[PDB]
Amino acid sequence: GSSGSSGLRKQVELLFNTRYAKAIGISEPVKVPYSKFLMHPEELFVVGLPEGISLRRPNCFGIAKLRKILEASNSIQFVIKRPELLTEGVKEPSGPSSG
C-alpha cells in the first residue's frame, strides 16, 4: 500500500469475523467459513457490502476496496440462512460386507 502496508486486511478480518459473531449471536469476532459462503452464496452471504464488492478473502481485494468494505462495516452484515452447511466434513463410504 502507498505509504504503509495494507493493514486493512487485519481490519477487514475483524469486520467479517466480528459480523459473523452476530450471525452466531456472538459478541467477539469469529472465523468466517468463506467456502461455506462461497459454495453456498444463496444460503450464507453478506449484505450491506459496497458496490463491486462481495464476500472473499481480505487480500484478493484492493486497498481501495478493503477500505470501502471497512467503510461499509456498519452496513455490512453476515446473514445466515443455512448454518447446517457450516457443519460439514468428509466421511468414508459404507461397504457391502466384510470377510
Side-chain angles (χ1 to χ4, degrees):
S2 203
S3 309
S5 207
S6 60
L8 311 173
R9 298 213 280 168
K10 297 287 178 204
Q11 314 223 93
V12 178
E13 298 227 276
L14 186 56
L15 169 59
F16 287 3
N17 285 49
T18 293
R19 291 281 162 287
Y20 194 62
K22 193 173 194 176
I24 51 169
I26 288 208
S27 223
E28 89 204 53
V30 170
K31 293 190 250 97
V32 156
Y34 294 145
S35 37
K36 298 289 141 139
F37 282 73
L38 297 173
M39 304 190 286
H40 318 271
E42 262 248 316
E43 292 70 79
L44 326 160
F45 57 80
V46 175
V47 291
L49 282 166
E51 218 207 61
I53 308 189
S54 213
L55 191 64
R56 280 214 156 197
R57 254 146 144 173
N59 174 21
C60 299
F61 291 100
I63 278 108
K65 299 189 146 148
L66 291 169
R67 297 188 183 275
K68 229 134 193 81
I69 291 151
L70 286 170
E71 304 220 57
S73 124
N74 299 18
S75 302
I76 276 179
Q77 203 165 325
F78 282 53
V79 174
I80 318 291
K81 312 258 260 134
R82 308 193 102 72
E84 68 172 78
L85 299 172
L86 310 186
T87 58
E88 233 184 80
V90 71
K91 70 164 253 247
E92 290 168 15
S94 53
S97 65
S98 208

